[PDB]
């Protein structure tokens, strides 16, 4: 399953010569199913509020293998999750709390510690 299947094409319809970097990027990953999205793509889709609901399963597996997964810096995925609004956790409300558990068990962090705090104040 892919982002096109969940939300369709949410781009304002226009020719690629008239598209912004995020509009362009979204057209490059919209047919990419969730299970293969790179880490960079995953963080950005979260940051950009792109059906975060159905992304949680993929996030849950990327972190178990590497809790500080990220492209631009270590911990970027946790940083992106910090931006979630709790209300858009519809049917994966359960999968989120599974993630919070893995996150609330760590030692090395810094300006990430407030993000980990911000994650815990969304319900």
């Amino acid at each position: 399953i892919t982002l096109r299947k969940l939300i369709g094409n949410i781009n304002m319809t226009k020719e690629p010569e008239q598209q912004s970097p995020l509009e362009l990027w979204f057209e490059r990953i919209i047919d990419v199913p969730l299970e293969k999205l790179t880490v960079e793509d995953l963080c950005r889709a979260i940051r950009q509020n792109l059906c975060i609901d159905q992304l949680m399963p993929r996030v849950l597996e990327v972190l178990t293998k590497e809790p500080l997964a990220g492209e631009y810096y270590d911990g970027e995925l946790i940083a992106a999750l910090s931006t979630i609004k709790g209300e858009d956790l519809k049917d994966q409300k359960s999968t989120f709390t599974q993630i919070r558990q893995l996150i609330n068990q760590l030692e090395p962090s810094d300006i990430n510690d407030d993000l980990r705090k911000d994650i815990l104040k969304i319900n």
Binding site: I10, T13, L22, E23, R44, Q48, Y72
Partner: protein, 96 residues
């Protein structure tokens, strides 16, 4: 005087210099002006949030390398602060 995974962080600065495109900055500024790119669902793309992420990575990796007594690492540090200055110079004073 010799590196470890500061290597894994000198590489991330230089390849983050394919996230400093002109339109990456210009999108950030137009967000600052209150003209973000609308989606069709309602709501907007947030280009200045991507720029904040880029600043955070560059700032973090420059800290990693700040006091590393090694030439290769100090070169990457100068490139990271040249790029941070490049971004800061575009925004400082904007909109006033």
């Amino acid at each position: 005087l010799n590196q470890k995974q500061e290597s894994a962080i000198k590489k991330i600065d230089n390849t983050i210099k394919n996230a400093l495109k002109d339109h990456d900055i210009i999108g950030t500024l137009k967000d600052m002006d209150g003209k973000p790119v609308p989606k069709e669902n309602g709501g907007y793309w947030d280009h200045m949030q991507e720029m904040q992420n880029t600043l955070r990575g560059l700032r973090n990796h420059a800290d990693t390398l700040k006091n590393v007594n090694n030439p290769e690492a100090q070169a990457a540090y100068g490139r990271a602060t040249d790029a941070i200055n490049k971004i800061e110079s575009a925004l400082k004073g904007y909109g006033i």
